[PDB]
Amino acid sequence: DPAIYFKEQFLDGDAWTNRWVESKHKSDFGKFVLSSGKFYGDLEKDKGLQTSQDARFYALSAKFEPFSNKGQTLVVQFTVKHEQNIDCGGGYVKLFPSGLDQKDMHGDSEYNIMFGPDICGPGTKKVHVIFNYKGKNVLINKDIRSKDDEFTHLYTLIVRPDNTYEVKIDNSQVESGSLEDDWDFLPPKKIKDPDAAKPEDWDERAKIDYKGTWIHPEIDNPEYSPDANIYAYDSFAVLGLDLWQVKSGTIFDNFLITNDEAYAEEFGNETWGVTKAAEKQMKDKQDEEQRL
Ligand SMILES: [Ca+2]
Incomplete structure (x- = not known):
């Protein structure tokens, strides 16, 4: 059976504010808002955390039972949707150890792993895979390309006990190695x-x-x-959304932290896979309705 350390889909309306904690390190952090955007697969289902304010830093986090990935696989999965036509903005997550003050989260808070797309102009269009190791946040030597369109995309990081990793976009491998x-x-x-x-x-x-x-x-x-x-890390306890966006409008959805690759793949088919085709279809109707 697969250990589900964290699953968040934002399905019970406003009850998400009980799980997610706003940081207070700064007075003027941006607001996250529950939204499925202007176009979607399903109105209710594809509701997630949308950034609502332009030119703002973001700092929201969710905690779960502290676990360790010693001797087992770690899988971090979520969907990002840059609905706004993004010029510059992060779309990545951060996994923190135990003993993080959620109410004090900022850019310099010591994390274990950072994973996800980062976009700033045509110059920067990459997926960050950063591991914290012996006081240093080391960035991956591999250049992985992030998605830049308006549609939902699935980002998956697999980390194995034999020191091997894999990165998937849209349930397909884009990077692999040790x-x-x-x-x-x-x-x-x-x-x-x-x-x-x-x-x-x-x-x-x-x-x-x-x-x-x-x-x-x-x-x-x-x-x-x-x-x-x-x-191997001694503890993961908090998943953080710690970002800078210029043009806001990014929707985060369907977070999964698990120890099972098969389940993460299946859950991706069950989540992003269900969204993408009805999502594309609705945009196409809005776009032909804009022209004709
Ligand atoms: Ca959702």
Whole structure:
């Protein structure tokens, strides 16, 4: 059976304000509002948290039973919908450890993992996969492209006990690999020898012998060691929405934190998969109704 650590779909009207907590680190944070937007799959179902104010920082968070991903898979899933035609704005989530003051959440609050799309002009159009490791928030070496249109898109991060990850957009893989490879967590395995130097007596000839070419010998880095527990965090307790938007209107929906890939895939088919086709159809009616 799959452990559902967190599931949020905003289905019981206003009762979401009991689960979600507004930060007070700043006086002028933006308002989140329950909304399904101007076009949708289903009026009631596709209701989520919409950013309501232009040029504002955002800070809302939801807590759940503290758990650890030690020895098991972690899956973070949600849908983002940039209904506004977004110029610049984050669409990512943050997973925090235990002992976060929800009422004090800001950009510098120490998180475990940040995952999701970030857009700022044509220049920045990427999915962030950031792990907190030994005091450093390390960004993925892989350039993953985020979605920029007005429709709902599903973002999924899978993290496994064997230090492997996967990123899915719309239930299809876009990036894959191992944590050690696609981030710079560890020091390089093979440094150059700090005890060696040329040979001004080195002979670069093969005249008609003593040969080779001077390649500075590499040794094992004494301060390198494998870390099998990179994937592992001692506690996740809070999912935070900590963002900056210029043009507001982004709807977040269908959050899932789980330990099961199959369930996350199935839940995605059951949520984004149900939305996308009725959503596209409604926009097409509004757009042809705008022209003709
Ligand atoms: Ca919903």
